[PDB]
Every structure is written in structure tokens, then in C-alpha cells.
Amino acid sequence: YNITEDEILEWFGITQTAQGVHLFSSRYVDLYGGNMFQFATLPVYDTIK
Amino acid sequence: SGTPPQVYNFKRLVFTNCNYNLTKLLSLFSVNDFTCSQISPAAIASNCYSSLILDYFSYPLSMKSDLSVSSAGPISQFNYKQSFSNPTCLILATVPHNLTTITKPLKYSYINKCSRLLSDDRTEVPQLVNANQYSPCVSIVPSTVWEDGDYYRKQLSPLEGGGWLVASGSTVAMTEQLQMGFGITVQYGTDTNSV
Amino acid sequence: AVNNNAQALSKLASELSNTFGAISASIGDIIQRLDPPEQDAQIDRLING
Amino acid sequence: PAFMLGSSVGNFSDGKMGRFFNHTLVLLPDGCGTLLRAFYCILEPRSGN
Amino acid sequence: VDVGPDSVKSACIEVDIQQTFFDKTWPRPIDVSKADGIIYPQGRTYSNITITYQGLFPYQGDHGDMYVYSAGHATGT
Numbered sequence: 001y002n003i004t005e006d007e008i009l010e011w012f013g014i015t016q017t018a019q020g021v022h023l024f025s026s027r028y029v030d031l032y033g034g035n036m037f038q039f040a041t042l043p044v045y046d047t048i049k
Numbered sequence: 050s051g052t053p054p055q056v057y058n059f060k061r062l063v064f065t066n067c068n069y070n071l072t073k074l075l076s077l078f079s080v081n082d083f084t085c086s087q088i089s090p091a092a093i094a095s096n097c098y099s100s101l102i103l104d105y106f107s108y109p110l111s112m113k114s115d116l117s118v119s120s121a122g123p124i125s126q127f128n129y130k131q132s133f134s135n136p137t138c139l140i141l142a143t144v145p146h147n148l149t150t151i152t153k154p155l156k157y158s159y160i161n162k163c164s165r166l167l168s169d170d171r172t173e174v175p176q177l178v179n180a181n182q183y184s185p186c187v188s189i190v191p192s193t194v195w196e197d198g199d200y201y202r203k204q205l206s207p208l209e210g211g212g213w214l215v216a217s218g219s220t221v222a223m224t225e226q227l228q229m230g231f232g233i234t235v236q237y238g239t240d241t242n243s244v
Numbered sequence: 245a246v247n248n249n250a251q252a253l254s255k256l257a258s259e260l261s262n263t264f265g266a267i268s269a270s271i272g273d274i275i276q277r278l279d280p281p282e283q284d285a286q287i288d289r290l291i292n293g
Numbered sequence: 294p295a296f297m298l299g300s301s302v303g304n305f306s307d308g309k310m311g312r313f314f315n316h317t318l319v320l321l322p323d324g325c326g327t328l329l330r331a332f333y334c335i336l337e338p339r340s341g342n
Numbered sequence: 343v344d345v346g347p348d349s350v351k352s353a354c355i356e357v358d359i360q361q362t363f364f365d366k367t368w369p370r371p372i373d374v375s376k377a378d379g380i381i382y383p384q385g386r387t388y389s390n391i392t393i394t395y396q397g398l399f400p401y402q403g404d405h406g407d408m409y410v411y412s413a414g415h416a417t418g419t
């Protein structure tokens with residue numbers, strides 16, 4: 001994944017559901033603001049413990 | 050393609066931002082058994098969703114009555130689960146005679162018990178595998194089971210709760226043709242409605 | 245008094261999204277996604293609620 | 294920051310905590326914070342100094 | 343079933359233990375009023391409304407899990 005550089009608070013989040021692994025960030029949508037938005041959906045096979 | 054895996058090894062495929070059609074797929078399927086819970090047979094080939102998840106595994110017709118949601122058989126105990134939060138469909142099919150791309154494994158198998166003991170060697174508790182989840186017994190039970198009642202054991206670290214994890218597997222031999230099973234679950238608002 | 249009338253009408257205007265244990269709220273979606281013999285029960289639950 | 298994830302815990306050759314088995318998620322920011330290299334893969338140790 | 347070659351020989355670079363220098367605390371707990379680090383609604387955005395919503399969140403003002411990196415030793419270049 002391509003990520004450019006900056007000096008802005010970047011939030012990031014990772015979670016897992018039965019659908020798969022969800023990766024959320026702020027670098028894709030709201031740079032100067034900052035919340036979660038799904039940029040990646042990963043086909044995980046087992047629940048991470 | 051390839052060899053279908055065991056029922057306690059259910060391969061999942063997720064579909065998003067694409068187009069599907071069962072008539073181009075189910076026609077080449079020798080569908081022995083067709084059930085759907087909380088959903089109609091016509092909905093899976095007509096209605097639009099947000100995403101699809103389809104789990105496929107090797108499954109003979111001998112334990113057909115264990116397909117029930119409320120069933121308490123070892124297949125429905127430590128091998129495979131279904132989600133109460135979404136409608137489901139269950140397909141039991143057979144390899145077509147004019148279809149040799151797929152391959153057959155050695156024998157059907159499942160896990161008859163999956164329980165965990167503690168270090169004290171006196172307390173034993175069975176673990177309940179959750180919906181669309183994998184039991185830790187999968188991490189130690191191999192892909193195939195050599196014979197009925199095969200025993201597997203492993204030591205658990207104290208940071209993981211300690212004790213031991215033990216399991217036993219049972220086998221059913223192949224029929225004339227290989228039988229397999231599919232579970233289908235739909236998702237309506239889990240992402241962009243595009244399928 | 246004005247807020248009382250407003251909330252009295254909003255009780256009707258808000259309650260239509262309730263399901264009463266039915267798998268969905270839209271009647272058309274119920275009859276789309278279900279066979280007759282269980283969509284009858286689902287519609288009956290909606291009727292009772 | 295980089296994050297590695299799994300579901301099976303063990304110890305190394307010296308018995309220290311941090312060794313995981315079977316398949317493992319590895320997430321690594323890379324290229325002076327440009328790439329987000331992620332893989333569910335198999336880790337294999339080396340036995341040098 | 344992916345791609346990627348192997349590296350250089352078995353000279354893993356020596357790894358040190360200096361946690362005493364790392365025992366420093368910059369306190370920045372979260373402020374839900376300031377609204378930093380909150381999951382958005384997963385599929386349906388809203389507009390100009392106050393909505394109760396069940397989801398996955400951290401508690402208010404959690405002190406956190408202090409980790410940080412640094413650079414290695416160097417005498418000149």
C-alpha cells in the first residue's frame with residue numbers, strides 16, 4: 001500500500017470479525033480531521049488471540 | 050479446483066464488488082440436498098447483498114441429519130458452526146461423473162471430542178467453538194485422520210492458560226463418489242452494497 | 245403542549261422501523277427474501293406489533 | 294509501528310517470551326514510512342549469532 | 343505461495359537491553375469530547391444528527407501502553 005508523508009496525527013485501527021480482518025485509517029479520507037474508514041479487508045482464516 | 054478439505058477445516062471465500070450467478074455454477078453441481086434457513090431458495094440467485102461468504106468442505110451424506118442448527122452432534126460441536134445473526138443456506142453435493150478436475154481425499158473424517166484439561170491433571174472443560182470460528186483443536190489435529198478414534202495431544206503454555214489440549218477423531222470411508230458440503234451466508238450492510 | 249403533540253405524532257412517525265423480532269422491517273423485503281410459510285409468520289409478528 | 298499477530302504462543306531456544314508457531318500475521322511500515330507490507334505467512338528461525 | 347528471496351548470512355545484529363532509558367511517560371489519554379480515535383459507522387454515514395450507536399471503543403481517558411522506538415549506537419559515522 002502506498003502512503004505519503006506528513007506531520008499530522010494519524011490514527012489507525014485493526015480489528016477482526018467473522019467476515020475478516022478490517023484495517024481502518026485516516027490517511028485515505030480525512031487527513032486534516034481524522035477518524036476511521038475501511039481501507040483494507042483481509043481474508044483471515046482464524047481468529048487472532 | 051484441488052481437494053476439498055475436511056469439515057473441521059472449512060475453507061471460506063468472500064465476495065465483494067463483483068457479480069455472481071448460481072445458474073452458471075449450480076448446473077454443474079450434483080446437488081443431493083438443498084436447505085436454507087431464514088432465507089428463500091430464490092433469494093440467493095436473485096437478491097442483491099453487500100457481501101457473500103461461502104464455506105466449502107468435504108462432507109458425506111452419512112451425517113446428513115447433523116446439518117441442523119440446533120443439532121448437537123460432534124460435527125455441530127467441534128467441527129463447524131453457523132451464525133445466528135444472518136440467514137444461511139446448506140448444500141450437500143456430489144462430484145459429477147463427467148467432472149474429473151476435482152480430486153478425492155483419502156477418507157471423510159471429523160472430530161468427536163475437543164476438550165482442554167488443566168495443569169492440575171484433574172479439571173477438564175470442553176471448549177465451545179463459536180459461529181464462523183475455529184477451535185484450537187484445529188491447530189493440533191492434522192488435515193487427515195488415519196483411523197477412527199485417533200488421539201492427539203499437546204502441551205499448553207502457562208501464558209495460554211497452561212495444561213494440555215487433547216482431541217480424538219473419527220473416520221468414515223469414501224463412497225463410490227466424493228460428497229462435499231457448502232454453507233452460504235449473506236451480508237446486507239457490512240460494506241458497500243455492490244454484489 | 246406543543247412538544248406533547250409533537251412527540252405524540254413522533255411516536256407513530258418513529259415506530260415503523262421496529263421489527264418485533266422479525267428478521268427485517270420492510271414488508272417488501274420480507275416477502276422478497278422469504279418463502280410464504282415463514283414470511284406469513286414474520287408478517288403476522290409485524291401485524292401484532 | 295509494526296505489529297505481529299497470531300494465536301499460538303511458545304518460547305525461543307533461550308526460553309524467552311515472543312515465539313509463535315504456525316501461520317502469523319506480520320505488519321510492517323517500510324521505505325521511510327511509505328509501504329505497509331502485510332502478510333499472513335510462516336516464520337522460520339535462524340540459528341546464527 | 344508468494345515471492346521473495348533469502349537474505350545474507352547468519353550474522354543477526356546484536357540486540358541490547360536498555361529499558362531504563364525507555365521508562366518515560368508522555369501523558370496523552372483520549373478525549374471523547376475532542377473526538378480522537380473513534381470508529382466510524384461501518385456502512386452508513388449520517389449528517390447533522392446526534393445518534394446513539396453500539397460499537398467497539400476505548401474507555402474515556404485511558405492512559406495507554408507506552409511504546410516508542412529510537413536510533414542505535416554510533417561513534418561518529
Ligand SMILES: *[C@@H]1O[C@H](CO)[C@@H](O[C@@H]2O[C@H](CO)[C@@H](O[C@@H]3O[C@H](CO[C@H]4O[C@H](CO)[C@@H](O)[C@H](O)[C@@H]4O)[C@@H](O)[C@H](O[C@H]4O[C@H](CO)[C@@H](O)[C@H](O)[C@@H]4O)[C@@H]3O)[C@H](O)[C@H]2NC(C)=O)[C@H](O)[C@H]1NC(C)=O
Binds near residue numbers: 008032033
Ligand atoms: C505544523 O503546523 C500545523 C500546526 O502547527 C499543522 O499543519 C497545518 O494544520 C492545519 C490545522 O488547522 C491545517 O489546516 C487545515 O486546512 C484544511 C484545508 O487545507 C487544504 O486546502 C488548502 C486550500 O484551502 C490547501 O492549501 C491545503 O494544502 C489543503 O489541500 C482544512 O480543511 C482544515 O479544516 C479542518 O479543521 C477546521 C477547524 O480548524 C474544521 O472547521 C474543518 O471542517 C476541517 O475539519 C484545516 O483548517 C493545515 O493544512 C496544515 N498544514 C499543512 C501544510 O498541511 C501540522 O501540525 C504541521 N504542518 C506541517 C508540517 O505542514
Ligand SMILES: *[C@@H]1O[C@H](CO)[C@@H](O[C@@H]2O[C@H](CO)[C@@H](O)[C@H](O)[C@H]2NC(C)=O)[C@H](O)[C@H]1NC(C)=O
Binds near residue numbers: 390
Ligand atoms: C443542524 O442541526 C442544528 C440543530 O437542529 C441546526 O441548528 C438550528 O438551525 C435552525 C435553522 O437552521 C435555527 O433556527 C436554530 O436556531 C438552530 N439551533 C441552534 C441551537 O442554534 C442546524 O441549522 C442544522 N444544520 C443543517 C445544515 O441542517
Ligand SMILES: *[C@@H]1O[C@H](CO)[C@@H](O)[C@H](O)[C@H]1NC(C)=O
Binds near residue numbers: 001002
Ligand atoms: C505505488 O506507487 C508506485 C510508483 O510507481 C507504483 O509502482 C505502485 O504500483 C503503487 N502501489 C499502489 C498500491 O498504488
Ligand SMILES: *[C@@H]1O[C@H](CO)[C@@H](O)[C@H](O)[C@H]1NC(C)=O
Binds near residue numbers: 187189314
Ligand atoms: C503448529 O506448530 C506446531 C509446532 O510443532 C505443530 O506441532 C502443529 O502441528 C502446528 N499446527 C498447524 C495447524 O500447523
